[PDB]
Design a protein around this ligand. Structure first.
Ligand SMILES: *[C@@H]1O[C@H](CO)[C@@H](O[C@@H]2O[C@H](CO)[C@@H](O)[C@H](O)[C@H]2NC(C)=O)[C@H](O)[C@H]1NC(C)=O
Ligand SMILES: *[C@@H]1O[C@H](CO)[C@@H](O)[C@H](O)[C@H]1NC(C)=O
Ligand SMILES: *[C@@H]1O[C@H](CO)[C@@H](O)[C@H](O)[C@H]1NC(C)=O
Ligand SMILES: *[C@@H]1O[C@H](CO)[C@@H](O)[C@H](O)[C@H]1NC(C)=O
Ligand SMILES: *[C@@H]1O[C@H](CO)[C@@H](O)[C@H](O)[C@H]1NC(C)=O
Ligand SMILES: *[C@@H]1O[C@H](CO)[C@@H](O)[C@H](O)[C@H]1NC(C)=O
Ligand SMILES: *[C@@H]1O[C@H](CO)[C@@H](O)[C@H](O)[C@H]1NC(C)=O
Ligand SMILES: *[C@@H]1O[C@H](CO)[C@@H](O)[C@H](O)[C@H]1NC(C)=O
Ligand SMILES: *[C@@H]1O[C@H](CO)[C@@H](O)[C@H](O)[C@H]1NC(C)=O
Ligand SMILES: *[C@@H]1O[C@H](CO)[C@@H](O)[C@H](O)[C@H]1NC(C)=O
Ligand SMILES: *[C@@H]1O[C@H](CO)[C@@H](O)[C@H](O)[C@H]1NC(C)=O
Lengths: 166, 978, 49, 147, 49
């Protein structure tokens, strides 16, 4: 709700959390000059002003050259307030469906949630890789009988363009 | 008598509710530990800048109260008597009587008001009287007190029960009761001061600390906290105040004829105007400044009030006339026909413009018609001639316009102000004024000689170091007053409160003491010894010890004085397999703050004036999301060196090596190890715009990579960093890691139980050290505190004016008139954009530092863990063995297991070995001897073996090498043959 | 360390036991063809210390 | 002591064998030194003398620390000259704009001057932070070219 | 920062508090880099026990 408490303007949820106000003190303040608590006139009640459930918006798109389905994202927000809607620690993600199987991370959402797959957009728990439980033992050794001379190519930016804005 | 006013005088300054915030503020306040004029007779005490009055307990009642400056009509008076359940706060000029009650409640001369319904007052009435900005303030906090001899301790903050708009002066007061020895009351003072007020969870000022009292209190003031620790803290700069003002104007005393320009009323037409030159006097500007006998007084450069303080190099008083309109064309750059052709002031004009009224003096002869600044050209050439006149006799009426053009600091000043000259002083910090060169300093003599044409010197940064003083023409140097960086050497409020003060680079003469190359250090005494440096003080001297503050010559670890010789060898006979934890950060708290929401609190007006700045917030968001993806990349680069995730074996039969502290804890719901849980415990909000993006790898996911890395290190070892993981038993991997640092593998298996016990005792000691002192895991604590401090100062910038009228945006701002609203929100947008840009620049530098440490951690877990680093002193002090990542939040705590020799011996050594006239050098190890038998052994473990061809190779003879001694080398074959 | 030498730093020049690297004049940068020895075809045996 | 005084405590080593092992650790067999010791010492001292001659006459031979010292001095002098900058400020560079202007106009002119000087000081602090990142990279390079 | 921006003056000293905590931030940065050089010298030279 946007509110005008006796001069102050803002927008947020007006809870009823318990606080004690001295008679000469009208309202509280946080570290900044944003009034966390304001005493409601005509009631002298305590209302802890809390900002709305805002948050950034991301997009889970698989590439126009591949598909066109879009899965808009709502991070750090409970979707109780506004396709299948899925919730996680990073936020509540719509346009995607959770799957129990573990898939490699293609489009990382946040808080371990990674995402088109079979004409649909998914949002799974990140598969940290093949759970290779190596069979250790006090007398177990593995020896490679062969090898692979592979030229891994890494690229390092040595010198940018020598821009010389005068 | 006099008694110690311990902590009283504090009160709620800002009238607003607050919680758990240390809002430091400065007002007229009572300093801690001040002297009071307690009376068992009412002393008429001067109300200097506010006073603090309190009664005593004494049981009974304090009857009535009498205040007021003098009660002698020199000021309007003041009176706060209490009676009949009412409080008369009338300002009447009451009776002057030393024995009042209603004895003095009379003489109704010029009163204000009265308040009722407040019959307040073993008790203690705490009162504050202050007059700030003309609004008298009264505070009250009545608290019972059993003791009456010694004033009890405790902090009591007063409340503004009323805010009187008395509108008077108050310069003394007293307190006279009624009649019934007698009871007592206290009286204190205030001073312009600053405190640091600590509010509670209910916004009750449970604590308060000064800073002008104690240098410890200075540290509490600057750091904005009630706690300080080990460390010198910069507080302020010790400046010597000036003694008394000195003005040295030249010997001239005549008065210049300003009447020969202003009283001169026959001005010269703008076509050919007249300029008057004036010099060599001390003529006053007071007559023109005070008596505003004009209509327009616009000054650029100087101001009407400050004109009397400066002496000028030269003054030209331009004089001409112009119509009532176009008077604004007499201004630097202001266009118009008169400015375009007749008279054009320079863009860098400096002077006062006086368009004093001439409806009766100007008015015919006063004719009028690009050109240079201060130009002058009068000439005449379907013709065209600019000869125009004006025969006037109010909108079109011409006026009189006089312009004074000053030039400052270009030549010996000649026209000065009315300020009387003052005797010169030398060799003392004195504020001065030489022809207008306002400043403070000490005046000494210098061997430099001013040229006769020269007037005053200068340095770089336009500092006038040398000025030839006028009226004496003497060489002088304006050396700045004695200034020195004052610091504090405090041992922390947790342990002590005694404080030591440093004076940076001041000879002791200018204020025990102990001279250092960094300056004289009071509050401490030198110690003729060497202790490990506690608080680096400066210039090689550094510091509580035995309940006493010291400051000694910094110890350098003492002089071991290793015994060198041509044959002096120390080979260690023992080692300690100690684990060392050098903690490194890898990531930080991702922020990615919404700049368009941070700077502009969802205000429609602010958004437009911010996008007008041209994608500043676009760059901010791009940089912040880039460094956030950089944190994710650092976390992946350090923890995800391996693709496959390895589960530790259910049965941990690791040759006696516990990893239960470091391997994941099955009992704990998460995968955090007991040591990881200890880390997480011991290392341990959403606002406008600010937000925290969760890492892609969660804390349990980061711990899962950490557990995978540990499992690979203890089961696959180092091969899983190259290709496929290879099952390695832990004793085998530790034997390999010995073999990789020049110590033979047999040391492990022949000391397997001993090394296992050493490893486990070491890990228990790591847990204990991390559980006792924060200094053990201080690294990530410091980086997290740095990030939190950056966020807190960023959000406190919201509460900063930045030049605007009000820091808060939503209510007071975005609410002015749209033009002025744009002006003030532009000031706020500039200030907050600068704050956010410096925050993101410090964050980019911090991200570069954390990225360097993250590449260090990646190269360690690629070398220290995924292999064994031959880089000596890279994975811990000593020959490195292996390492364990631990998923500490926003960092890694490496357990850099290292091989450190402990017990040494002395032996006789030779570079070579001679047998049968043929040299013999060691294949591996160093030739040494217990005395009669020579032995070769590993360089870092005393494991002597007999010398045979296996451990030696031949090259040369026994007549070329110096330092060779004979011995015998046996055959690895002859005893086999025999 | 990797072009005019062999780096013993594990997992520094190419993922594996580094052999050598060939520089290539990529524009405004460089490209290393990090030749590496990456084992494969493991076979489990019984070990003793 | 050689290298041992950084691993654990100092363990004395005569210089001949320490330099023999410093050959042995780079693939050069120790037998080179024990036969070339005289020439090795002579080349050592002659090269130290060459360093001395390069320091006595050759300029900018120590140009790296000299360069960083000159950079710091230039930055400090740049700050000092920025004190002598206008940024506007009623065409006045002296901070003592007062004794010439009333508190309002002195306030606005001096506020422009504080904006300019704060921008210059923030530029100095940012350049010092970047330069200190470079110095810290070189210091962690020396601490790894030491030890 | 107080002496650089303002020196012996006190009115602009008051005005500088109005520009947030830039004085404190800059002084803290300078102290941090000073301790940085101190620990650089300690890590380079003073690494000997
Ligand atoms: C604020 O005041 C409340 C008053 O309820 C404090 O809570 C405690 O409440 C009980 C009664 O339920 C009292 O007996 C205690 O004396 C109160 N404690 C204190 C310290 O007053 C609450 O703790 C107070 N908060 C603070 C610390 O300011
Ligand atoms: C969303 O709300 C539900 C119930 O209102 C609560 O259980 C849940 O914790 C909230 N979201 C998150 C992320 O916890
Ligand atoms: C109050 O001040 C006025 C000033 O004009 C004076 O005439 C008057 O006598 C004073 N006292 C009374 C009676 O209010
Ligand atoms: C100047 O003129 C004023 C009135 O215009 C007159 O009172 C005064 O005597 C004159 N003298 C001087 C010195 O200005
Ligand atoms: C301090 O002054 C004394 C005499 O005034 C002088 O002897 C001494 O050298 C000065 N301090 C130093 C560090 O030289
Ligand atoms: C070596 O030191 C360990 C402890 O560091 C000790 O237990 C042992 O007795 C010592 N001697 C030998 C030969 O291991
Ligand atoms: C060491 O290991 C044994 C068995 O592996 C275990 O019982 C014991 O608890 C471990 N020690 C600690 C301190 O956890
Ligand atoms: C070796 O001998 C010297 C001379 O006696 C002595 O100072 C030193 O303590 C001895 N020990 C070692 C291991 O240096
Ligand atoms: C030196 O070592 C050998 C073998 O341990 C031993 O026989 C001999 O007695 C020792 N001599 C001295 C000088 O202690
Ligand atoms: C070794 O022995 C030879 C003869 O056997 C002798 O000439 C030589 O001087 C000895 N080496 C010494 C004394 O260092
Ligand atoms: C390893 O090899 C032995 C002998 O062939 C075999 O008995 C065992 O099952 C193998 N184990 C694994 C981990 O494959």
């Amino acid at each position: 709700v946007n509110f005008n408490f006796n001069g102050l303007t803002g927008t947020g949820v007006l809870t009823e959390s318990n606080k004690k106000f001295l008679p000469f003190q009208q309202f509280g303040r946080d570290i900044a000059d944003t009034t966390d608590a304001v005493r409601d006139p005509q009631t002298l009640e305590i209302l802890d002003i809390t900002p709305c459930s805002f948050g950034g918006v991301s997009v889970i798109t698989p590439g126009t050259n591949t598909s066109n389905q879009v899965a808009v994202l709502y991070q750090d927000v409970n979707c109780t307030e506004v396709s299948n809607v899925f919730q996680t620690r990073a936020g509540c993600l719509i346009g995607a469906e959770h799957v129990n199987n573990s898939y490699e991370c293609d489009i990382p959402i946040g808080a371990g949630i990674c995402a088109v797959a079979s004409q649909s957009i998914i949002a799974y728990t990140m598969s940290l890789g093949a759970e290779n439980s190596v069979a250790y033992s006090n007398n177990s050794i593995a020896i490679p009988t062969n090898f692979t001379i592979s030229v891994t190519t890494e690229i390092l930016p040595v010198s940018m363009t020598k821009t010389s804005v005068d | 008598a006099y008694t110690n006013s311990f902590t009283r005088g504090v009160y709620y300054p800002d009238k607003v509710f607050r919680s758990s915030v240390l809002h430091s503020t400065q007002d007229l306040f009572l300093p801690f530990f001040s002297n009071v004029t307690w009376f068992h007779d009412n002393p008429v005490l001067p109300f200097n800048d506010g006073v603090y009055f309190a009664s005593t307990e004494k049981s009974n009642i304090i009857r009535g109260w009498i205040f007021g400056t003098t009660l002698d009509s020199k000021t309007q008076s003041l009176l706060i008597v209490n009676n009949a359940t009412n409080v008369v706060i009338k300002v009447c000029e009451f009776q002057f009587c030393n024995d009042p009650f209603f004895r003095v409640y009379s003489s109704a001369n010029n009163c204000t008001f009265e308040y009722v319904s407040q019959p307040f007052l073993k008790n203690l009435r705490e009162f504050v009287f202050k007059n700030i900005d003309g609004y008298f303030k009264i505070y009250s906090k009545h608290t019972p007190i059993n003791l009456v001899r010694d004033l009890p301790q405790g902090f009591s903050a007063l409340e503004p029960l009323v805010d009187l708009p008395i509108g008077i002066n108050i310069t003394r007061f007293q307190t006279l009761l009624a009649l019934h020895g007698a009871a007592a009351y206290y009286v204190g003072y205030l001073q312009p001061r600053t405190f640091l007020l600590k509010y509670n969870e209910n916004g009750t000022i449970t604590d308060a600390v000064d800073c002008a009292l104690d240098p410890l209190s200075e540290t509490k003031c600057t750091l904005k906290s009630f706690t300080v620790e080990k460390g010198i803290y910069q507080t302020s700069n010790f400046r010597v105040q000036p003694t008394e003002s000195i003005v040295r104007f030249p010997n001239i005393t005549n008065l210049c004829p300003f009447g020969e320009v202003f009283n001169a009323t026959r001005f010269a037409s703008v076509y050919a105007w007249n300029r008057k030159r004036i010099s060599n006097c001390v003529a006053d500007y007071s007559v023109l400044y005070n008596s505003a006998s004009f209509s327009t007084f616009k000054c650029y450069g100087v101001s009407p009030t400050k004109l009397n303080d400066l002496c000028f190099t030269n003054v030209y008083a331009d004089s001409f006339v112009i119509r009532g309109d176009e008077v604004r064309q007499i201004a630097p750059g202001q266009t118009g026909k008169i400015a375009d052709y007749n008279y054009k002031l320079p863009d860098d004009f400096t002077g006062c413009v006086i368009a004093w009224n001439s409806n009766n003096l100007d008015s015919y002869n006063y004719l009028y018609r690009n050109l240079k600044p201060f130009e002058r050209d009068i000439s005449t050439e379907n013709c065209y001639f600019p000869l125009q006149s004006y025969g006037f006799q109010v909108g079109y009426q011409p006026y009189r316009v006089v312009v004074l053009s000053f030039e400052l600091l270009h030549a010996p000043a000649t026209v000065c102000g009315p300020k009387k000259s003052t005797n010169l002083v030398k060799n003392k910090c004195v504020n001065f004024n030489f022809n207008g060169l306002t400043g403070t300093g000490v005046l000494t003599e210098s061997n430099k000689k001013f040229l006769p044409f020269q007037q005053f010197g200068r340095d770089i940064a336009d500092t006038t170091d040398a000025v030839r003083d006028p009226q004496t023409l003497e060489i002088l140097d304006i050396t700045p007053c004695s200034f020195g960086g004052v610091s504090v050497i405090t041992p922390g409020t947790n342990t002590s409160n005694q404080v030591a003060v440093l004076y940076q680079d001041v000879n002791c003469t200018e204020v025990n003491v102990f001279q250092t190359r960094a300056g004289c250090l009071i509050g401490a005494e030198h110690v003729n010894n060497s202790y490990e440096c506690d608080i680096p003080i400066g210039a090689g001297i550094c510091a509580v010890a035995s309940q006493s503050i010291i400051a000694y010559t910094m110890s350098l670890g003492a002089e071991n004085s290793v015994a060198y010789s041509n044959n002096s060898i120390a080979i260690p006979t023992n080692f300690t397999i100690s684990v060392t934890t050098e903690i490194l950060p890898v990531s930080m708290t991702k922020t990615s703050v919404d700049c368009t929401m941070y700077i502009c609190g969802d205000s429609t007006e602010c958004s437009n004036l911010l996008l007008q700045y041209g994608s500043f917030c676009t760059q901010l968001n791009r940089a912040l999301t880039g460094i956030a993806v950089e944190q994710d990349k650092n976390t992946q680069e350090v923890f995800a060196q391996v693709k496959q995730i390895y589960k530790t074996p259910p049965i941990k039969d690791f040759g006696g090596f516990n990893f239960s502290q470091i391997l994941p804890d099955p009992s704990k719901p998460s995968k955090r190890s007991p040591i990881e849980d200890l880390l997480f415990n011991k290392v341990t909000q959403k606002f406008n715009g600010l937000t925290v993006l969760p890492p892609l790898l969660t804390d349990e996911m980061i711990a899962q990579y950490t557990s995978a890395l540990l499992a690979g290190t203890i089961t696959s070892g180092w091969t899983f960093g190259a290709g496929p993981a290879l099952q390695i038993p832990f004793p085998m991997q530790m034997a390999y890691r010995f073999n990789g640092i020049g110590v033979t593998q047999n040391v492990l298996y022949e000391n397997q139980k001993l090394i296992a016990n050493q490893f486990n005792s070491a890990i228990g000691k790591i847990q204990d050290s991390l559980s006792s002192t924060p200094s053990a895991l201080g690294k990530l604590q410091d980086v997290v505190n740095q990030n939190a401090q950056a966020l807190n100062t960023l959000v406190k910038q919201l509460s900063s004016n930045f030049g605007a009228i009000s820091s808060v945006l939503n209510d007071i701002l975005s609410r002015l008139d749209p033009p002025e609203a744009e002006v003030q929100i532009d000031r706020l947008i500039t200030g907050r954009l600068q704050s956010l840009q410096t925050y993101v620049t410090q964050q980019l530098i911090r991200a570069a530092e954390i990225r360097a440490s993250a590449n260090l951690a990646a190269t360690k877990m690629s070398e220290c863990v995924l292999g064994q680093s031959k880089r000596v002193d890279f994975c811990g002090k000593g020959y490195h063995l292996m390492s364990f990542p631990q998923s500490a939040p926003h960092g890694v705590v490496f357990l850099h297991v290292t091989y450190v020799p402990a017990q040494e011996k002395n032996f006789t050594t030779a570079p070579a070995i001679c047998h049968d006239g043929k040299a013999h050098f060691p294949r591996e190890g160093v030739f040494v001897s217990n005395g009669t038998h020579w032995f070769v052994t590993q360089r870092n473990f005393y494991e002597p073996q007999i010398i045979t061809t296996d451990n030696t190779f031949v090259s040369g003879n026994c007549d070329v090498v110096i330092g060779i001694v004979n011995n015998t080398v046996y055959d690895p074959l002859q005893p086999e043959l025999d």
